[PDB]
């Protein structure tokens, strides 16, 4: 019942490795479905080609901004911005996929992949998935970041779609 989408990551054009995600349909069906439709482009837009504009080593890797590509864009499929489905799932550790919002009730397309346990974000950010395979490929995108978010090389989602 849990949709499975993936990102083929690239560093400076070069494909780095694949990173698949479970879209927790049962716990977060509104939020995970968004990522699912955004991953396919069957909505007309989505994450394909987008980059990870903000990567902070030991914290997380943030992407999803396919409109302005920096933190100020992105638009969900329920329009432009949907309310946080719930906060049932906590940021329990590396691999956790959660929504990157701009103040409560503002989920769009931005998301972040955790590279450590971020319990402080519990209740503030909607957890909706987790790295299945390639969590080492996300630890690969880790090094090309810094304290402030800014990445060295250009981390991009080469392709994307659903596998199961």
């Amino acid at each position: 019942v849990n949709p499975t989408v993936f990102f083929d990551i690239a560093v400076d054009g070069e494909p780095l490795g694949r990173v698949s995600f479970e879209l927790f349909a049962d716990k977060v069906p509104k939020t995970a479905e968004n990522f699912r439709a955004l991953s396919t482009g069957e909505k007309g837009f989505g994450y394909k080609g987008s980059c990870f504009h903000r990567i902070i080593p030991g914290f997380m890797c943030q992407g999803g901004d396919f409109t302005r590509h920096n933190g100020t864009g992105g638009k969900s499929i329920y329009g432009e911005k949907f309310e946080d489905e719930n906060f049932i799932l906590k940021h329990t550790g590396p691999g956790i996929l959660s929504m990157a919002n701009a103040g409560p009730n503002t989920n769009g397309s931005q998301f972040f992949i955790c590279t450590a346990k971020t319990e402080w974000l519990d209740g503030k950010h909607v957890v909706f998935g987790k790295v299945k395979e390639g969590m080492n490929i996300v630890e690969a995108m880790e090094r090309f970041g810094s304290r402030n978010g800014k990445t060295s090389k250009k981390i991009t989602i080469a392709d994307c779609g659903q596998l199961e």
Binding site: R54, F59, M60, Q62, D65, G71, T72, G74, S98, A100, N101, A102, T106, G108, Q110, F112, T118, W120, L121, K124, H125, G149
Partner: peptide, 6 residues
């Protein structure tokens, strides 16, 4: 601007 902190 979007993006979690800490």
């Amino acid at each position: 601007h979007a993006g979690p902190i800490a």
